[PDB]
Amino acid sequence: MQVEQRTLNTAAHPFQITAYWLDQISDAVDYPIMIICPGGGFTYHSGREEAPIATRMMAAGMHTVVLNYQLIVGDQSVYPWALQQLGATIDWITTQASAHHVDCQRIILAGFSAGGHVVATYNGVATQPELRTRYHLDHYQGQHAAIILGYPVIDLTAGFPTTSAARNQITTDARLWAAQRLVTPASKPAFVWQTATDESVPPINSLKYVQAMLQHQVATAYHLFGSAIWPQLALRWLQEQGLLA
Amino acid sequence: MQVEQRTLNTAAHPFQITAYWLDQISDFEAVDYPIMIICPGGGFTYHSGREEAPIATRMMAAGMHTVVLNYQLIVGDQSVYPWALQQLGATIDWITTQASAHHVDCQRIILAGFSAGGHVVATYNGVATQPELRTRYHLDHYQGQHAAIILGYPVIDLTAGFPTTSAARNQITTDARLWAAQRLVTPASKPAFVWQTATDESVPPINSLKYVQAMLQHQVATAYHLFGSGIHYLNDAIWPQLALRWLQEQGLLA
Ligand SMILES: [Ca+2]
Known part of the structure; x- marks a missing residue:
């Protein structure tokens, strides 16, 4: 693999991303x-x-990119910057698509905890024209085919953060507080998993989202472990979705 | 293994069961499974x-005896409850009287319910674990107790999906107190391993979620696996594997 360090800029909010470019086996097909x-x-x-x-x-056959989305550091708010940074990253990939043999019909978003909130929200926002224009995403090219969420934060009042002050610090746009309440039949398929012994982020967050997803008849998979397991389930799910090639 | 057919009676509502008694490894070497x-x-x-x-x-391949309980049906214009629960307690009671002849670990009795059977097991997990309720449905006289319950695409709420009509509901039981098992869950409920496919239309997936949400709410050990595909280190069935691991961690698969 090849490691590529970059500092991208969008809406005057520069962010860092690390691209792990998969190397061809023969050293051609898209991954x-x-x-x-x-x-x-x-x-x-x-x-x-x-x-x-x-x-x-990656070992399963895919490229990876870590997106260091907007933080509250320096007295800032996460949204709407984070979504814009994500859409721009998807965009940055289409331009790099050919040089690194990237299958743009199989872009997958993966979020964890606080990162899960960004990915879950983007799944609701980037899937609706009204929202794409409202949060300025109409000029970005490309789209994701699915998402993977691990012990994700979904509702900004269902446990994390603990104070409303930290909530508003994340964003004063209540419309983006609860990702589940953005799910529509247009949302992309999602694979959600989490442990039931997680104290940092309340398991109810997952349930809330998975329900909405199920209600709007959107392909889903939820795995709330009791205590190497999920990776296998996730990969198998991606095959099912035909997103693994 | 050895198979045994029996027709037990309780609460004047006869029911049938089948027991598959696991055999010991070596006759020269015993232990309760x-x-x-x-x-x-x-x-x-x-x-x-x-x-x-x-x-x-x-x-059973994992090393555990199994009993199949053919609980009260609606046939002959009958109601499922409260008979169903009484029949389940009796079965557990009957097992405790056989445990010494068939090497049964009564500290490890698991209740697995599927579809309509899941309602029985999900309800029992709440009713048998509550004094007031255990007496309201005539169970104070039954011996033994379960340690955990498994649920596969079970019915939890009789007003959210299955059945379709309101008549079939009152038929199953006119006791609204036994319609939504998720409302009978308390810190006393036993650990439960739940699984189901999302594409299942026969019985709405929302049922699972409701019961799991209740279990989590009262901080009761619980696992949930809603597979995206309806076909369902780790062998490539799959849920049985997960469940087994769960029982192992639960120290119930000893
Ligand atoms: Ca014994």
């Missing part, structure tokens, strides 16, 4: 790509779990 | 066996 939005309660970007995951997925 | 009472699906009009049979064989 899927996964964008990873890390956890970190919007105070930092997590990497302890993200590193092993990015590797696992 | 867990037992799984399986309540079949069938929408309360019949007793399913297509999925149940294979499931029993797979779970």
